[PDB]
Design a protein around this ligand. Structure first.
Ligand SMILES: Nc1nc2c(ncn2[C@@H]2O[C@H](COP(=O)(O)OP(=O)(O)OP(=O)(O)O)[C@@H](O)[C@H]2O)c(=O)[nH]1
Ligand SMILES: Nc1nc2c(ncn2[C@@H]2O[C@H](COP(=O)(O)OP(=O)(O)O)[C@@H](O)[C@H]2O)c(=O)[nH]1
Ligand SMILES: [Mg+2]
Length: 414
């Protein structure tokens, strides 16, 4: 048998709308990540999708078919049990141009990524470009490019596109990244991709002694109809542990916390609670480390967590000191052009009084520019952000032609 362990690595899946991200994750894991009504009706990803799988290798078989996602080697002709390698998970991003902020919140959780490129569409499409640039900015450099939908193009067309992809990465940080051709729909060459994931998206080093920090991307009321009462539960908070570890019965706090009134003004009150349970997928654990998206059970009133109310928050230990800032100073750089537009325009300099969109960790916040200097801006935010370390990456977006567009990035200076 294989052990039951949490995923140890997060692999982002990014790329232009409908190029096959969610179908690729299904091909690898058997899971369709879309769970929301509007996602199922529109046939598109809207919220961040998630799925897990074990990975193993049949030591008596040849690669790539030796790589498997279940404890069997029957498919490559061996009665031996495959050797367990690791459990992995996928952060399945929306590709739609209006949902770039959601992709960015997911990229803060990624240990590596797969950029999916449809073989039957012109290259490079706007969000092929935009997600590629975003990965570079955020520093997700452990990248595999997957050429999907090769089932509906000729060998000649696929090779032509392959050469344009290599030329696109030429002279960039991604110059050496592998391109793996597959069909997600018909599950062709998926074993080569799994081998690729093992070779190019290794589990990163973690620091388990750093102050525990979880970036929140989901929060739920897990109580369903037709249940007794001795099986009802407090609110659940879901996200990615980016450093340290958490344990059942630990006293924790949610930051910035709850929007409340205090002394005639709007305030954020840190939410203190205790960890009641820890789950990854369908399995319970006594502790949680980086890797995977964890569900943290709490003793909170489920009305506090219902419907992703805490999205963008962080969780730390109760006694941790974490800055919560209404005003932030950013050492910034601007992109040369608006890469996500169908027509790439030049990026205008930042001006005082502009309303910008800031991506910080899993949070997305609007703010007004109160100060512009050559490489430093100061922003008055509409909501405070939790800033758990010095020099956290932020991505800057501006509304251009009715759309939020990524235009730059920087470090939040504390
Ligand atoms: N022929 C062919 N069609 C595919 C393949 N992979 C995905 N598709 C089809 O492409 C369409 C979009 O697939 P999705 O997996 O939903 O693409 P997506 O990238 O997740 O789309 P968004 O999340 O909305 O940005 C669906 O109709 C799929 O069945 C493939 O390998 N070959
Ligand atoms: N820690 C913890 N997590 C839970 C518990 N029950 C459910 N979860 C997790 O919370 C998430 C939401 O649960 P689910 O029943 O699917 O709620 P739904 O998505 O609204 O239908 C899932 O990913 C579960 O793994 C629990 O008792 N403790
Ligand atoms: Mg999708």
């Amino acid at each position: 048998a294989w052990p039951k362990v949490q995923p140890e690595v997060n692999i982002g899946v990014v790329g232009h709308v409908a190029h096959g991200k969610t179908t690729l994750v299904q091909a690898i894991t058997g899971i369709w990540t879309s769970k929301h009504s509007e996602e199922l009706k529109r046939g598109m990803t809207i919220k961040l999708g998630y799925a897990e799988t074990n990975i193993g290798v049949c030591e008596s078989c040849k690669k790539p078919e030796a790589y498997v996602t279940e404890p069997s080697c029957k498919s490559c002709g061996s009665d031996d049990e495959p050797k367990f390698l690791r459990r992995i998970s996928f952060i399945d991003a929306p590709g739609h141009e209006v949902l770039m902020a959601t992709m960015l919140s997911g990229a803060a959780l990624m240990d590596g990524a797969i950029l999916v490129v449809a073989a039957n569409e012109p290259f490079p499409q706007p969000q092929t470009r935009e997600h590629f640039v975003a990965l570079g900015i955020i520093g997700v450099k452990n990248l595999i490019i997957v050429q999907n939908k090769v089932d509906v193009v000729s060998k000649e067309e696929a090779l032509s596109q392959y050469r344009q992809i290599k030329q696109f990465t030429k002279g960039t940080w991604a110059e050496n990244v592998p391109i793996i051709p597959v069909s997600a729909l018909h599950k062709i060459n998926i074993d080569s991709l799994i081998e690729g994931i093992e070779e190019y998206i290794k589990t990163p080093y973690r620091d388990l002694s750093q102050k525990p920090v979880m970036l929140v991307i989901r929060s739920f009321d897990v109580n369903k109809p037709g249940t007794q009462f001795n099986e009802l539960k407090g609110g659940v908070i879901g996200g990615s542990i980016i450093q340290g570890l958490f344990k059942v019965d630990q006293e924790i706090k949610v930051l910035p916390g709850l929007r409340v009134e205090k002394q005639g003004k709007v305030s954020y009150e840190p939410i203190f609670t205790k960890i009641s349970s820890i789950r990854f997928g369908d399995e319970e654990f006594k502790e949680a480390k980086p890797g995977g998206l964890v569900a943290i059970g709490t003793y909170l009133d489920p009305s506090l967590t219902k419907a992703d109310n805490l999205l963008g928050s962080i969780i730390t230990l109760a006694d941790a000191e974490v800055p919560v800032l209404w005003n932030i100073r950013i050492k910034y750089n601007l992109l040369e052009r608006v890469v996500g537009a169908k027509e790439m325009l030049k990026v205008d300099p930042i001006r005082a009084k502009e309303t910008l969109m800031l991506s910080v960790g899993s949070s997305t916040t609007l703010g007004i520019v109160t100060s512009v200097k050559k490489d430093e801006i100061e922003v008055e935010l509409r909501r405070p952000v939790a800033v758990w370390s010095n020099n956290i990456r932020t991505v800057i977006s501006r509304q251009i032609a009715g759309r939020w567009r990524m235009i730059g990035w920087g470090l939040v200076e504390i």
